[PDB]
């Protein structure tokens, strides 16, 4: 929406900050054991209930 309340906006900000895979050096550090993040999502598929 165009007209957002700040509280909702800050929950959207948190989801934006967490939506990313582990860095490449983490994959190296863990010998490829850690390659995915549970916070990884796509805006079209996994919907936030914000």
């Amino acid at each position: 929406a165009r007209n957002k309340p700040l509280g909702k906006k800050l929950r959207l900000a948190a989801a934006l900050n967490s939506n990313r895979n582990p860095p490449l050096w983490v994959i190296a550090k863990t010998k490829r054991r850690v390659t995915r993040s549970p916070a990884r999502r796509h805006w079209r598929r996994q919907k936030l209930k914000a």
Binding site: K8, R11, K49, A50
Partner: protein, 52 residues
């Protein structure tokens, strides 16, 4: 009409928002209390023994 066409109308409204006390998407904005923890109608935390 009750199936797919009527699902089209669930695109814009809401019954619940996030509850400030428990954080779930369960605060009934019209009733003004949380369906999960009871915030807004009960100062004690809602939890029933029939729930695991």
């Amino acid at each position: 009409m009750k199936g797919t066409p009527s699902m089209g109308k669930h695109n814009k409204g809401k019954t619940h928002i996030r509850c400030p006390r428990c954080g779930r998407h369960s605060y009934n904005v019209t009733k003004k209390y949380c369906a999960s923890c009871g915030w807004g109608r009960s100062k004690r935390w809602r939890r029933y023994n029939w729930a695991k």
